[PDB]
Write a protein that binds this ligand. Structure first.
Ligand code: FES
Ligand SMILES: [Mg+2]
Ligand SMILES: [Mg+2]
Lengths: 111, 220, 232, 25, 133, 98
């Protein structure tokens, strides 16, 4: 399991490694981007493995490691969303919005 | 902190009507909203008999003089709970008013559940929300019956979790477990709109009063 | 320590209930096994918990493993507690006659030092509740679950002296032979007191039990009654 | 108060339906 | 956490007893508000019963004197061709005008129902409202 | 101060008496394809099919004439201790209120 401190240290390491890679490739570290990181890592570590995921990768720790839940209530205990106790706050919020849009109208190649 | 408790939380309980909920409504207003119109005599529930003025051509009439006192007590309790920053959860399975109730709950900064009630929201909350979830301090039923004309499971679950309940109870409903029942019509849109207006206004004024009193206490 | 018998689970203590998910601790609660049965295989256990100060409850746990059944029953029992009123924190307020399903229970209030002369399961539950002096007789089917349900129901539905005073609006006065004709007022109405006396019922229309009348008249001859027994 | 309802038999009670031969020999 | 025996007592009695016994360390947020402002009835569970024998519901039928007049009207002049407007809190039907005139004629005159009926009909026709028998 | 008894006594709904075969004015408040939901001042609305004659005039807010049959449709069925209600009034749609 990946504790948040581990992810924080990974983020710091990625930032320092990004500045190192920009130093190596002669580019300005400030404007150095993820496309630039991909190009530089493809040049420095050439790999013709057919699997694009078996090739060397230098990604942000957020992207490469999985994600976790979000906090749904603060220290006072009150949930942030008014539809929290449904257990499907996002879905029912979306349905509520759609129904309101339909009510407003009633008053008035792709998949 | 003792002075804070005494001046903020204990003071409002010393007054009969601290938030002045009595001027939000009157018997004439409830009459104009058709709050007195109940179901037919054949659908009458026994425990709703004491609240019924009579039966007008096989149609029950809800005594509004009792509704006034019951609504006064319910609105006072709701205002006091909102002043105490308690979580308030409106519940209603009447799909004609789901949108209105959700809008009202969002407006007064409280919570709504107008959808299918999955087994164990309240009794099994720790597994379904998390080990540290906070349950509502008060539940307001605008409709106490589900769509098969049987009590909402949330009534019994709220009794089990020792959560006080306010409820609008029609002539065919069971008020035995609602802590603060309000006999009234819950079908006609006018009555439901009136209930939503009253409860929203009470909660909002209670919150404003809480902020005002805290600010005054801090200044002095 | 053994329970009611050497090879019996009943009467054995399971220790304090586990700290609940609600964040509460129950180090003051004691748990006792009332019944263990094989369900045809799984195990069904009936246990009772109590803190000795009026708070008591009971629950059933079902599971393939006996320890899991114990844990389930205990944790569910702590969340279904009754509060039992006690007269001077040693006995019940009045005689209670009840029938649950086919089990009849007759409980009698007793003075201090009388002990617990009751069915062994009733003795265990009374030790958990905190009752120290009481008499109890069980008739009909001796079904452990019905016995427990009836006991908890009757003990929860007892009217205290304060409740009786408030209902009748009169002074509840105790007469003790050891204290002579001194009237001891144990409860007074919180509201105003009625100025008219109760009807002096010349002969009340009460339902008497033939066993009690037989015992009072000396016509009971049972060789098993009033036998010497260890302290309870 | 004069507005209270008064005890009374239903004045709108419709007559019981009769068969086509009711009252005829 | 409190007891879940919803059929025993009420939430207030259970919470009060468990707070007194020490099981609950602190009273819940609503306890003081309830205690200061209790409901008219303590919310104790009760099983509704079916009535049998001579036991009858105590609900009375709502009748007024003028209903009799109304009945006669709706049987003689029939339902008024004019439609009811229940949204108007002060709507006045032809039957209501007839009832008011009948009551006035009763209070300013004698008490013979048939004579009152015909006199009321005459007065309303004089006013100019159509009443087809 | 008017009491509830006076309000009930002088209410138009009380004055109407029996609801069967009474002409009332209702207002359309909801339309679902060809089904019009009409409030006439009672506890429940009544739902009527859009007429085939001049059907386009029936819109939300439209005033219509109704012949009431029942303020609420209920009936007790075999093996039941309470009436079953559809939560709807029974009425006949006549036309538009000119
Ligand atoms: S209905 Fe009267 S004789 Fe047949
Ligand atoms: Mg209803
Ligand atoms: Mg042995």
């Amino acid at each position: 399991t990946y504790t948040e401190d581990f992810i924080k240290k990974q983020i710091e390491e990625f930032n320092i490694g990004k500045r190192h890679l920009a130093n190596m490739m002669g580019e300005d570290p400030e404007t150095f981007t993820q496309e630039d990181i991909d190009r530089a890592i493809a040049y420095l570590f050439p790999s013709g493995l057919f699997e694009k995921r078996a090739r060397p990768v230098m990604k942000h720790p957020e992207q490469i490691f999985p994600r976790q839940r979000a906090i749904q209530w603060g220290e006072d205990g009150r949930p942030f969303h008014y539809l929290f106790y449904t257990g499907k706050q996002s879905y029912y919020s979306l349905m509520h919005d759609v129904y309101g849009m339909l009510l407003n109208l009633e008053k008035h190649g792709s998949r | 902190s003792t002075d804070f408790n005494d001046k903020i939380l204990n003071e409002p309980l010393k007054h009969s009507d601290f938030f002045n909920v009595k001027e939000l409504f009157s018997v004439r207003s409830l009459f104009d909203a058709r709050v007195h119109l109940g179901h037919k005599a054949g659908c009458r529930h026994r425990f709703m008999e004491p609240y019924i003025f009579g039966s007008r051509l096989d149609h029950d009439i809800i005594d509004l003089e009792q509704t006034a006192t019951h609504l006064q007590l319910a609105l006072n309790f709701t205002a006091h709970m909102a002043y105490r920053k308690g979580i308030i959860l409106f519940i209603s399975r009447n799909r004609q008013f789901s949108y209105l109730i959700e809008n009202m709950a969002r407006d007064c900064g409280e919570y709504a559940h107008t959808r299918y009630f999955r087994g164990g929201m309240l009794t099994n909350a720790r597994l379904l929300f998390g080990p540290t979830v906070r349950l509502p301090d008060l539940i307001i039923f605008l409709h106490t019956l589900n769509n098969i004309f049987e009590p909402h499971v949330a009534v019994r679950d709220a009794a089990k979790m020792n959560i006080p309940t306010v409820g609008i109870v029609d002539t065919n409903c069971n008020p035995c477990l609602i802590t603060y029942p309000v006999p009234g019509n819950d079908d006609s849109p006018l009555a439901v709109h009136l209930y939503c207006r009253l409860f929203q206004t009470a909660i909002t004024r209670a919150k404003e009063k809480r902020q005002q009193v805290e600010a005054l206490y801090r200044l002095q | 320590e053994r329970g009611w018998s050497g090879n019996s689970w009943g009467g054995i203590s399971l220790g304090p209930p586990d700290p609940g998910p609600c964040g509460e601790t129950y180090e003051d609660f004691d748990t006792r096994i009332l019944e263990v049965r094989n369900v045809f295989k799984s195990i069904r256990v009936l246990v009772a918990v109590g803190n000795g100060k009026g708070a008591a409850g009971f629950s059933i746990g079902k599971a393939t493993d006996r320890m899991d059944a114990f844990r389930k029953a205990k944790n569910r029992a702590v969340h279904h507690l009754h509060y039992i009123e006690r007269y001077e924190d040693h006995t019940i307020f009045h005689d209670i006659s009840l029938r649950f399903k086919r089990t009849h229970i007759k409980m009698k209030k007793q003075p201090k030092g009388y002990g617990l002369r009751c069915h062994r399961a009733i003795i265990t539950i009374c030790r958990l509740i905190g009752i120290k002096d009481m008499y109890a007789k069980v008739s009909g089917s001796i079904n452990m679950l019905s016995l427990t349900q009836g006991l908890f129901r009757g003990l929860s539905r007892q009217e205290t002296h304060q409740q009786l005073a408030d209902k009748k609006g009169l002074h509840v006065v105790e007469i003790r032979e050891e204290c002579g004709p001194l009237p001891i007022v144990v409860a007074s109405p919180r509201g105003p007191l009625r100025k008219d006396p109760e009807p002096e019922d010349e002969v009340p229309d009460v339902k008497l039990d033939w066993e009690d009348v037989k015992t009072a008249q000396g016509m009971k001859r049972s060789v098993w009654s009033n036998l010497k027994r260890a302290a309870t | 108060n004069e507005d209270l309802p008064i005890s009374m038999e239903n004045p709108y009670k419709e007559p019981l339906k009769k068969c086509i031969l009711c009252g005829k020999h | 956490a409190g007891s879940r025996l919803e059929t025993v007592g009420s939430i207030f009695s259970r919470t009060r007893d468990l707070v007194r016994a020490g099981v609950l360390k602190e009273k819940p947020l609503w306890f003081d508000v309830y205690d200061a402002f209790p409901p008219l009835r303590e919310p104790v569970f009760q099983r509704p019963r079916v009535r049998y024998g001579k036991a009858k519901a105590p609900i009375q039928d709502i009748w007024y004197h003028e209903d009799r007049i109304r009945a006669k009207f709706y049987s003689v002049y029939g339902s008024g061709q004019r439609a009811f407007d229940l949204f108007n809190p002060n709507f006045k039907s032809t039957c209501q005008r007839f009832v008011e005139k009948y009551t006035e004629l009763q209070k300013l005159g004698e008490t013979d129902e048939e004579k009152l009926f015909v006199e009321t009909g005459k007065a309303l026709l004089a006013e100019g409202v159509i009443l087809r028998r | 101060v008017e009491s509830f008894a006076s309000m009930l006594r002088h209410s138009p709904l009380t004055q109407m008496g029996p609801a069967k075969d009474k002409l009332v004015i209702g207002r359309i408040f909801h339309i679902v394809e060809n089904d019009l939901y009409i409030d006439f001042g009672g506890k429940f609305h009544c739902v009527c099919r859009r007429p085939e004659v001049d059907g386009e005039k029936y819109q939300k807010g439209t005033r219509v004439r109704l012949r009431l049959l029942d303020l609420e449709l209920t009936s007790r069925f075999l093996g039941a201790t309470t009436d079953t209600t559809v939560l709807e009034a029974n009425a006949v749609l006549l036309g538009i209120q000119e």
